[PDB]
Amino acid sequence: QDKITVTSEKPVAAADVPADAVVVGIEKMKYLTPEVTIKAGETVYWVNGEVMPHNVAFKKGIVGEDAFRGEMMTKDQAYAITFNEAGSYDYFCTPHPFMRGKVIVE
Numbered sequence: 450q451d452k453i454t455v456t457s458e459k460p461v462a463a464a465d466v467p468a469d470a471v472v473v474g475i476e477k478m479k480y481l482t483p484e485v486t487i488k489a490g491e492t493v494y495w496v497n498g499e500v501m502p503h504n505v506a507f508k509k510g511i512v513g514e515d516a517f518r519g520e521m522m523t524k525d526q527a528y529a530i531t532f533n534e535a536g537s538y539d540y541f542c543t544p545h546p547f548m549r550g551k552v553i554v555e
């Protein structure tokens with residue numbers, strides 16, 4: 450089905466993120482780590498630092514045949530995606546498509 454596994458449909462509190470996680474922070478309309486590289490099976494967390502809501506989304510054909518739109522995080526919410534397959538995955542923020550980043554899975 451999908452190259453990815455979503456954990457929780459819902460955003461979790463940043464207080465729920467584990468200490469050893471790879472975390473991509475979001476501040477000032479930017480993903481703070483624009484290119485992160487993990488191994489298949491690892492989970493990436495995004496944590497929104499600001500009051501502007503931000504999500505993580507994938508166009509069609511990137512993590513599956515369909516498009517994927519994560520739920521919106523408000524301030525200090527976090528969001529997790531587990532990447533099962535090796536590859537390069539671009540995401541963007543649905544209401545702010547100039548916000549982009551990528552995950553390299555190997």
Ligand SMILES: [Cu+2]
Pocket residue numbers: 502503504542543544545548
């Ligand atoms: Cu955004």
